[PDB]
Design a protein around this ligand. Sequence first.
Ligand SMILES: Cc1cc2nc3c(=O)[nH]c(=O)nc-3n(C[C@H](O)[C@H](O)[C@H](O)COP(=O)(O)O)c2cc1C
Ligand SMILES: Cc1c(-c2ccc(-c3ccccc3F)cc2)nc2ccc(Cl)cc2c1C(=O)O
Ligand SMILES: CCCCCCCCCC[N+](C)(C)[O-]
Ligand SMILES: O=C(O)c1cc(=O)[nH]c(=O)[nH]1
Length: 358
Amino acid sequence: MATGDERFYAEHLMPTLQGLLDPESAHRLAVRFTSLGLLPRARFQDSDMLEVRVLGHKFRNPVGIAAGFDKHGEAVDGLYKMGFGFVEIGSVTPKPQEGNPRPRVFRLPEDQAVINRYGFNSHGLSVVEHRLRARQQKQAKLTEDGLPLGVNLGKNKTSVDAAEDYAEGVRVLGPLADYLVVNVSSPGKAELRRLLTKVLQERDGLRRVHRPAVLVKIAPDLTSQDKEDIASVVKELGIDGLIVTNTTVSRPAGLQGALRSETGGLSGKPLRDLSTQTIREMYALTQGRVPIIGVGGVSSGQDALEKIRAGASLVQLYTALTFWGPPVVGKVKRELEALLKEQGFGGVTDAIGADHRR
Ligand SMILES: Cc1cc2nc3c(=O)[nH]c(=O)nc-3n(C[C@H](O)[C@H](O)[C@H](O)COP(=O)(O)O)c2cc1C
Ligand SMILES: Cc1c(-c2ccc(-c3ccccc3F)cc2)nc2ccc(Cl)cc2c1C(=O)O
Ligand SMILES: CCCCCCCCCC[N+](C)(C)[O-]
Ligand SMILES: O=C(O)c1cc(=O)[nH]c(=O)[nH]1
């Protein structure tokens, strides 16, 4: 057990844990350990180079934990201790729901990938609300210290009115979040405008200290038309940002994992460049004026900086954590800082969208 060390986790601890446990058991255990603060390190001290000011907030470093690891808001503080510059919880649905039957997550070790069809298993808004209320002032200090909190909002499976599910989440969790996320993406145009109009009106109805940024999270499987439409609505309505991307329902040629034909969203290395390209396109479509959080197959500084250069102001990872473990956070940050220096950027901020100016 005990402490590391990137090599010890990646070469020994994590693979052993994967050989003993199915992915959902290891996920639950990870959330357990993290929430108790049973973490190695973190020996990495964030430099001013890594600091980003975006979405009305200061981010100590641009490396966050993506939605889906901490679905129910149970490990937020342990995730900050892990070295993440921001935490996104969820997706959270209005009512509790169990999600899909098990097994519903599948490891593709040869591809450094996962396929998941959790189906939005959620403790629901009420349980999450109280859990965030119990630490609300602690979070206010973390946020002020440059460690913001995002809440990803979902909808119930049997929901009659999608927009109202999101509106409810906005009202309930919005006062507790630095930013909110609406998935247009889990595996309109006038309909999308309709939904996002409602979400933004609900957000604007909150008291001034309790007003989060609103971001839209997209899949990497959208047509060119979908992406044009989204960009257009985002700019018309003044959506605060985009998260790019969710998992893919595509199966790129070359996947080796025996489980590659499982239904669900694919994450990790095979998603990486598909996601970066979507960032590139969404940045150009929004004239570099809409903050993007880049997510999809990030496990190194190069991965992170490619997304930043492509137009991301911030990045997230998830699947890398499942293979490398907690030390992956400091690894990405250390490598990113070294790459920024090597490439003559003063900091992360100078690198945002740098490819578009070549
Ligand atoms: C186990 C699993 C569950 C996920 N659950 C959610 C979810 O609840 N809501 C969401 O927006 N994204 C969810 N995601 C997608 C991730 O947030 C992220 O967009 C995607 O995995 C790409 O990042 P990655 O390659 O670093 O994993 C999930 C991903 C995985 C691996
Ligand atoms: C190992 C692991 C892990 C995982 C991640 C982090 C840790 C960990 C956390 C706190 C301290 C020490 C640790 F090793 C343990 C285990 N998480 C997952 C999350 C979601 C899914 Cl689908 C799979 C996993 C897996 C896995 O591949 O089994
Ligand atoms: C989920 C398996 C986690 C096993 C790793 C245990 C973390 C080491 C704890 C380090 N420390 C002594 C500081 O608590
Ligand atoms: O809960 C899930 O099944 C899920 C949600 C989501 O937004 N993305 C994903 O890959 N899985």
